[PDB]
Amino acid sequence: GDALSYYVDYNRSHRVVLSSELPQLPDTYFDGDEQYGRSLFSLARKIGDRSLVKDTAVLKHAYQAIDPNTGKEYLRSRQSVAYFGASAGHSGADQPLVIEPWIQGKISGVPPPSSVRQFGYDVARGAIVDLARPFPSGDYQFVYSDVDQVVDGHDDLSISSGLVESLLSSCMHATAPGGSFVVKINFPTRPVWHYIEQKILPNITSYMLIKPFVTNNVELFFVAFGVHQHSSLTWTSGVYFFLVDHFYRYETLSTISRQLPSFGYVDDGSSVTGIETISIENPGFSNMTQAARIGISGLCANVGNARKSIAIYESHGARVLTITSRRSPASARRKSRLRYLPLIDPRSLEVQARTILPADPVLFENVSGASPHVCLTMMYNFEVSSAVYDGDVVLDLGTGPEAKILELIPATSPVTCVDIRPTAQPSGCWNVRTTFLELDYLSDGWITGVRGDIVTCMLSLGAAAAGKSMTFDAAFQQLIKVLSKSTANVVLVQVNCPTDVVRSIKGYLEIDSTNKRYRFPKFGRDEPYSDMDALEKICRTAWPNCSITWVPLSYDLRWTRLALLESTTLSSASIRIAELMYKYMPIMRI
Amino acid sequence: ANVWGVRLADSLSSPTIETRTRQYTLHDLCSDLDANPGREPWKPLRNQRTNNIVAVQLFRPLQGLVLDTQLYGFPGAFDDWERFMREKLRVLKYEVLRIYPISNYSNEHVNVFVANALVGAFLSNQAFYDLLPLLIINDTMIGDLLGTGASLSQFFQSHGDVLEVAAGRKYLQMENYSNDDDDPPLFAKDLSDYAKAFYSDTYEVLDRFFWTHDS
Amino acid sequence: APILRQWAEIIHRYWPNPSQIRYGAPNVFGSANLFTPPEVLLLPIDHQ
């Protein structure tokens, strides 16, 4: 799918930031193993040419530029144009892809160009040259740097930073007075920002930086406005925070890439997360096969509740049934948490009387991805695991029959699963005692009998209100009565709290101002919501020392990394919708 | 379920209904000799994958055919085989009508064994005019056959009621058959000669006949 | 190997078929048969 690009521009309101304030790029970026990992992500990342789409987006934003003193847009259409190092490529395009649509007027938001200047050895249309050294060229109002970049070394990157200073000087000489130019920040260095600050901040009236990110890297794009026009342009606190955000995000993406499996490698089963499939031929289930039973039990232990597809095909004179699934690290944790090796009943298998054709293995089971509801459940699960801590008794509200949280929870600390609907899992194999209560998740009086250390109410609070037909405030008061039964020092409850002003997301959920509730058409359900102030006051009354913290799921892709651990592709729009719902449905940490 | 290398379902279907037996009549003989185009008995058999006829499905009669197929010399073309067979049937039909007037016995009983042997003779173009009186079933096909002593021992041999020979082929292999996996197996039904078995009226007397008979 | 293949096919489809004959008088001469059923005499070919 599409990549995420981060664009920032000079803001006078923003407090000025110093070159010193900006963080240095990590040395690991030039590590060879790190480069191989980034290459692996590039292989695992499926998208259209990053460069062409990036040029179109940057051009549209450039066309959005307005000069404030003028009261008119900074960009004037048909101004002299410069494209640095246009590249034909070995592809045989013969020019930058972005250029063709712009020439054909196929790019929305692009005013017709009076002229287009082409440069670059690879591009046949562009002047065939290398921008490594100074050369004679025309003066153009607009400059776009697309030159292929070759650097002697990362240590030479300091020399490379000086060459980039030379590149900027060349851009200035090429540009007309009052002109503008664009240079991609292929390498970001603190010295580089310092140099631009020392000699170039005055030269250009305005500036903007956009990082189009399709894959994890620190490359940036620098935009220069009012070139040849004196300016006081300087770094700003907001811009610096954006840079810090970029570095943190890159670090997280790199760490995920470091855990990435080999692309289309031969699977020997070594991977903790890897396909699990075995073939059974002419199996006899009339009595206890045992050997077949043992193999099935082992496969189940490997799957750890993973979905497994079975095909029975006849070859070499005999029908053969193959079960196919994928092992996982979390499933492996569940397997390690089994105290003993369990056995299974094959009556359903004996019941099976059908033939399935053979299939060829592929690492990815399917390309569907995760539903926004599924994604939010993952965000909540990741948050709970982060909330998982040493030596803690646990209580879970609205627990499902699957109870995946138990697999997530380490064996040493005890946990409690509670819901109206009975669970479907078996607890005999667990290495440590696990507690599941067959009582309504909203049922009462069991708490008075139960001793309390820590309690969780995830993805069940709205359902509880719907079941008891209570208002969110009323449900919360009944919950406070349960809390009176409850003794947990630390309590987290998923809550429908509209911390943000109510805003509906089209296609997913409908929120009612008249009745404080969230109705989700995507899941086709309606659950009420309540005012935060009243709940906070009630909580302080319940415990004078009680401290409740709003939980920030957003700003973190680690729950998305958990999906990657599940080999699940992630989509930004659904994640954003889930984040908006979380702003109106935060988890209360108390 | 599994016995030996074979696994079978414990649930089974056992039917309680069987079709009632029907006796053969002279009109039935005439209709079969007529071999109506609307329901010609012969059925072409096609290799399943090809769907191309490689064999012939065989019904009743022609169950008296035991000679080498090389002697028979069947036409390769299925349609040509049908045309030649139809001409032979028409001529044989005039001959049968001449031998016995239809008015005298429209549905009279005839010896099925005799009918099959006559089919074999006509196919090998041998004279069954001598056996034509024998063709009509008088009372017992077994009794009538026990009375008859004419013809070669090879053409047909009955020790009293007991008679051991091969019945007509269930399937006829055609020229196209290649013994392909897609080709259906005829289980030796196509074989002109597969085995000789002794037919007799009573099992106990048959066993007494077989007291020292090779087993 | 056309000739050899044809020869093999002929042998399979044309090898001669043997038969047997009943012989001997049990009431007076009894049975001289040793490894075969009484009165049975093997014949290299089927008899018509």
- Concatenating the DSSP letter of every residue in A494-527 gives E-----SPP--BTTTBEEETTTTEEEETTTTEEE
- Those residues with Cβ within 8 angstroms of residue A345's Cβ, 6 or more apart along the chain or in another chain: none
- C48/B212 Cβ within 8 A: no
What is the sign, positive or negative, of the torsion defined by CA atoms of A30, A31, A35, A38?
Answer: negative
Helices B26-34 and B78-99: angle between axes, nearest 10 degrees: 140
**CB-CB contact of A308 with A325 (8 Å):** yes
Q: Which of A282, A286, A353 is closest, CB to CB, to B5?
A: A282
Alpha carbon distance A583, B92 (integer Å): 99
Q: Which of B155, B193, B214 is closest, CB to CB, to C37?
A: B214
**CB-CB contact of A403 with A415 (8 Å):** no
Residue A515: both structure tokens together? 């009745």
**CB-CB contact of A227 with A178 (8 Å):** yes
Give burial (CB, 10 Å; 0-12/13-18/19+) of A21.
Answer: middle
- B5/A286 Cβ within 8 A: no
Chain A, window 330-359: residues with a beta carbon less than 8 angstroms from a chain B beta carbon: 353
Give alpha helix (H) positions in A109-236: 156-174, 190-195
* Chain A residues closer than 8 Å to B9 by CB: 353
- Those residues with Cβ within 8 angstroms of residue B37's Cβ, 6 or more apart along the chain or in another chain: none
- C37/B154 Cβ within 8 A: no
Alpha carbon distance B168, B162 (integer Å): 18
A251-256 long-range Cβ contacts below 8 angstroms, 24+ apart: A251/A26, A252/A556, A252/A557, A252/A558, A252/A561, A253/A41, A253/A216, A253/A557, A254/A28, A254/A34, A254/A37, A254/A38, A254/A216, A255/A561, A256/A557, A256/A561, A256/A564
Instruction: Mark B104-134 as b/e (b = at least 16 C-beta within 10 Å).
Output: eeeeebbbbbbbbbbbbbbbeebebeebeeb
> Which amino acid makes up residue B195?
A
The beta-strand segments (E) located in A271-415 are 274-281, 309-315, 318-327, 396-397
- B9/A282 Cβ within 8 A: no
Alpha carbon distance A117, A183 (integer Å): 16
- Name which of A280, A281, A286, A314 to mutate to probe chain B: the one with the most chain B Cβ atoms within 10 A of its Cβ: A286
**CB-CB contact of C43 with C18 (8 Å):** yes
A317 → chain B, closest CA residue:
B5
Which whole-number Å values give the CA distances from A153 to A30, A161, A190, B146, in the listed order? 10, 11, 17, 112
> Which amino acid makes up residue B70?
Q
B73: left (phi over 0), alpha (psi -120 to 50) or beta: left
The H or E element that residue A228 is part of is none
The beta-strand segments (E) located in B68-161 are 158-159
**CB-CB contact of B134 with B158 (8 Å):** no
Distance of CA B192 to the CA centre of its chain: 11
Q: Which of B153, B155, B214 is closest, CB to CB, to C47?
A: B153
Chain C, window 19-38: residues with a beta carbon less than 8 angstroms from a chain B beta carbon: 20, 37-38
> Which amino acid makes up residue A567?
S
Residues from B contacting C (CB-CB < 8 Å) are 152-155, 157, 193, 212-215
Strand A490-494 versus strand A454-457 pairing type = parallel
A287 → chain B, closest CA residue:
B1
Whether A284 has its CB under 8 Å from any CB of chain B: the answer is yes
Alpha carbon distance A568, A444 (integer Å): 38
* Chain B residues closer than 8 Å to A353 by CB: 9
Which whole-number Å values give the CA distances from A149 to A138, A152, A157, A186, in the listed order? 21, 10, 12, 8
Closest CA to A260 of A34, A26, A513: A34
* Chain B residues closer than 8 Å to A282 by CB: 2, 5, 7
Q: Is A275 helix (H, G, I), strand (E, B) or coil?
A: strand
Alpha carbon distance B154, A403 (integer Å): 83
**CB-CB contact of B162 with B200 (8 Å):** yes
Residue B83: both structure tokens together? 């045309």
Closest CA to A397 of A467, A306, A331, A295: A467
- A284/B5 Cβ within 8 A: no
Closest CA to A497 of A520, A539, A529: A529
In the DSSP assignment, the letter for residue A273 is S
Distance between the two ends of chain C, CA-based, in angstroms?
37
Q: Is A246 helix (H, G, I), strand (E, B) or coil?
A: helix
Distance from CA of B6 to the nearest CA of A (A): 8
Strand B52-57 versus strand B158-159 pairing type = unpaired
- Those residues with Cβ within 8 angstroms of residue B53's Cβ, 6 or more apart along the chain or in another chain: B44, B45, B46, B78, B174, B176
Residue B120: both structure tokens together? 């074999």
- Those residues with Cβ within 8 angstroms of residue A162's Cβ, 6 or more apart along the chain or in another chain: A195
Distance from CA of C25 to the nearest CA of B (A): 14
Instruction: Mark A251-280 as b/e (b = at least 16 C-beta within 10 Å).
Output: ebbbebbeeebeeeeebeeebebbbbbebb
The H or E element that residue A576 is part of is helix A572-584
A318 → chain B, closest CA residue:
B5
Residue C47: both structure tokens together? 């008899």
Return the number of CB contacts < 8 Å for B and C: 18
Whether A282 has its CB under 8 Å from any CB of chain B: the answer is yes
Residue A127: both structure tokens together? 């002047």
Alpha carbon distance B109, B117 (integer Å): 16
C47 → chain B, closest CA residue:
B154
- A353/B2 Cβ within 8 A: no
Alpha carbon distance A473, B92 (integer Å): 103
Q: How many CB atoms lie within 10 A of CB C22?
A: 11
What is the sign, positive or negative, of the torsion defined by CA atoms of A238, A241, A247, A252?
Answer: negative
Do C and A make contact via 3 or more CB pairs under 8 A? The reply is no
Instruction: At B146, give phi and psi (nearest 5°).
Output: -60, -40
What is the sign, positive or negative, of the torsion defined by CA atoms of A95, A98, A101, A105?
Answer: negative
**CB-CB contact of B26 with B153 (8 Å):** no
Distance from CA of B20 to the nearest CA of C (A): 38
* Chain B residues closer than 8 Å to A286 by CB: 2, 7, 10
**CB-CB contact of A141 with A76 (8 Å):** yes
* Chain C residues closer than 8 Å to B211 by CB: none
- Those residues with Cβ within 8 angstroms of residue B140's Cβ, 6 or more apart along the chain or in another chain: none
- Name which of C10, C13, C36 to mutate to probe chain B: the one with the most chain B Cβ atoms within 10 A of its Cβ: C13
Q: Provide the greatest CA pair distance for chain B.
A: 62
Instruction: At A325, give phi and psi (nearest 5°).
Output: -155, 180
What is the sign, positive or negative, of the torsion defined by CA atoms of B118, B120, B122, B128?
Answer: negative
Give burial (CB, 10 Å; 0-12/13-18/19+) of A408.
Answer: middle
Alpha carbon distance A407, B123 (integer Å): 81
Alpha carbon distance B29, A530 (integer Å): 95
A513: left (phi over 0), alpha (psi -120 to 50) or beta: alpha
Distance between the two ends of chain B, CA-based, in angstroms?
34
**CB-CB contact of A325 with A277 (8 Å):** yes
- Name which of B4, B6, B7 to mutate to probe chain A: the one with the most chain A Cβ atoms within 10 A of its Cβ: B7
Residue B102: both structure tokens together? 């239809």
* Chain B residues closer than 8 Å to C38 by CB: 212
Q: Which of B7, B9, B10 is closest, CB to CB, to A284?
A: B7
Whether B39 has its CB under 8 Å from any CB of chain A: the answer is no
**CB-CB contact of A160 with A151 (8 Å):** yes
- Those residues with Cβ within 8 angstroms of residue B182's Cβ, 6 or more apart along the chain or in another chain: B47, B48, B49, B50
**CB-CB contact of A319 with A355 (8 Å):** yes
Alpha carbon distance B141, B203 (integer Å): 17
Structure-determination technique = cryo-EM
- B154/C46 Cβ within 8 A: yes
In the DSSP assignment, the letter for residue B185 is P
> Which amino acid makes up residue A236?
T
Alpha carbon distance A565, A331 (integer Å): 11
Helices A237-258 and A558-565: angle between axes, nearest 10 degrees: 20
- A284/B9 Cβ within 8 A: no
Residue B98: both structure tokens together? 């001449």
| CA atoms within a 13 Å half-sphere pointing along the CA-CB vector of B73 | 4
Residue A206: both structure tokens together? 């305005």
C20 → chain B, closest CA residue:
B214
Distance from CA of B211 to the nearest CA of C (A): 9
Return the number of CB contacts < 8 Å for A and B: 9
Give burial (CB, 10 Å; 0-12/13-18/19+) of B95.
Answer: middle
Q: Which of C20, C46, C47 is closest, CB to CB, to B214?
A: C20
Bridge partners of A296, per DSSP, are none
- B212/C39 Cβ within 8 A: yes
Distance from CA of B188 to the nearest CA of A (A): 22
A68: preceding bond cis by omega (within 30 degrees): no
Closest CA to A57 of A4, A93, A112, A103: A4
Q: How many CB atoms lie within 10 A of CB A225?
A: 24
Alpha carbon distance A233, A240 (integer Å): 14
**CB-CB contact of B102 with B108 (8 Å):** no
Residue numbers followed by a gap, chain A, C–N over 2.5 Å: none
Instruction: At A98, give phi and psi (nearest 5°).
Output: -60, -35
Distance from CA of B119 to the nearest CA of C (A): 20
Q: Which of B2, B9, B10 is closest, CB to CB, to A284?
A: B2
The H or E element that residue A295 is part of is helix A291-303
What is the sign, positive or negative, of the torsion defined by CA atoms of A528, A533, A536, A540?
Answer: negative
Closest CA to A213 of A444, A4, A489, A13: A4
* Chain A residues closer than 8 Å to B7 by CB: 282, 284, 286
* Chain C residues closer than 8 Å to B212 by CB: 37-40
Alpha carbon distance B102, A221 (integer Å): 108
- Those residues with Cβ within 8 angstroms of residue B55's Cβ, 6 or more apart along the chain or in another chain: B44, B45, B171, B172, B173, B174, B177, B183, B184, B186, B190
Q: What is the DSSP string of A404-417?
A: HHHHHS-SSS--EE
Distance of CA B215 to the CA centre of its chain: 25
- Those residues with Cβ within 8 angstroms of residue A416's Cβ, 6 or more apart along the chain or in another chain: A393, A394, A395, A396, A435, A436, A437, A450, A455
* Chain A residues closer than 8 Å to B10 by CB: 286
B191 → chain C, closest CA residue:
C13
Which whole-number Å values give the CA distances from A529 to A175, A473, A476, A512, A517, in the listed order? 58, 8, 10, 9, 4
Distance from CA of B51 to the nearest CA of A (A): 23
> Which amino acid makes up residue A295?
G
C-contacting chains (≥3 CB pairs under 8 Å): B
The beta-strand segments (E) located in A214-258 are 220-227, 235-236
Residue A559: both structure tokens together? 């729950």
Helices A558-565 and A372-387: angle between axes, nearest 10 degrees: 110
Instruction: At B70, give phi and psi (nearest 5°).
Output: -60, -40
Whether A315 has its CB under 8 Å from any CB of chain B: the answer is no
Closest CA to A327 of A566, A60, A18, A77: A566
